[PDB]
Design a protein around this ligand. Structure first.
Ligand SMILES: O[C@@H]1[C@H](O)[C@H](O)CO[C@H]1O
Length: 288
């Protein structure tokens, strides 16, 4: 039973696979042991809460977590903090009002400037479509995912401010490749003049690229993803996707572990209500 535990989401999303690897490799530099668990893609809020409670009961020094929802891990995170575990919030911000009410805190929150992500993707699309612009659509993450919402707002605002761009559709595909395919299929059907998709992540971007291929419209309709997973990078090189706004999940993981280990060294968990340490990891546009 390692010194530290991490709870990540489905390894069916290479984003979480790369964050896992990043964490293992940092652990090797720091010389600490980590146990890493991934929630099944179909696992419900309750089932992640039970895992965290169960990890909380073992002899872990700290737990880092990417929560299924802003609220689902409030009570178990508050109970781990109460026990004096060093807690780090990865990717998606836990509801800090509800965490306060529950008498808990976390040491730190490690994430990407996700407004900037969405803006970067939209700005790339606006610059690419040039003077004539045209109709664009957004394939959203799961409802209530703050990081997805940030990308949606960032992109939407960029599109709004460009007079030559009309956002014709904005619909969730819940981080799921197959749902993204089905949704993108229907959008194309309803908008024969569609020029581009922005997609809040790469599993959805890859579904959307398949929908564009199905309609025989590769190169004709732009597809911009987010995360920079290998298969999306491959698609970009091959010209099946236009671009992706790369995150660095390996760095989000490494930085989160380091924050948890550093916190532990002081021998004091962060006091309640005190704003956790905030660490931003860069994003970059990748194109062909
Ligand atoms: O930032 C992460 C990644 O974009 C993942 O692909 C979907 O969930 C988001 O919160």
């Amino acid at each position: 039973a390692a010194e530290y535990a991490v709870v990540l989401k489905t390894l069916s999303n290479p984003f979480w696979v790369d964050m896992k690897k990043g964490i293992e490799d940092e652990a090797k530099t720091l010389g600490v042991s980590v146990d890493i668990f991934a929630s099944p893609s179909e696992g419900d809020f309750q089932s992640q809460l039970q895992l965290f409670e169960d990890l909380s009961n073992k002899k872990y020094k700290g737990i880092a977590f990417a929560p299924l929802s802003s609220v689902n891990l409030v009570m178990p995170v508050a109970r781990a903090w109460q026990k004096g575990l060093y807690l780090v919030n990865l990717d998606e911000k836990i509801d800090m009002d509800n965490l306060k009410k529950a008498g808990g805190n976390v040491e730190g929150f490690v994430t990407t400037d996700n407004v900037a992500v969405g803006a970067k993707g939209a700005d790339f699309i606006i610059n690419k479509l040039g003077a004539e612009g045209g109709e664009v659509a957004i394939i959203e993450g799961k409802a209530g995912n703050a990081s997805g919402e940030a990308r949606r707002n960032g992109a939407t605002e960029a599109f709004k401010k460009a007079n030559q761009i009309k956002l014709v559709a904005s619909q969730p595909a819940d981080w799921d490749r197959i749902k993204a395919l089905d949704v993108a299929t229907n959008v194309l059907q309803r908008n024969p003049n569609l020029k581009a998709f922005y997609c809040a992540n790469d599993t959805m971007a890859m579904g959307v690229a398949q929908a564009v291929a199905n309609a025989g419209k590769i190169g004709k309709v732009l597809v911009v993803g987010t995360d920079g997973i290998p298969e999306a990078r491959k698609m970009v090189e091959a010209g099946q996707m236009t671009a992706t706004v790369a995150q660095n999940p390996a760095d989000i993981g490494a930085t989160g572990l380091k924050l948890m280990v550093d916190a532990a060294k002081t021998g004091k968990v962060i006091p309640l209500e005190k704003t956790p340490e905030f660490k931003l990891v860069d994003s970059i546009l990748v194109t062909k």
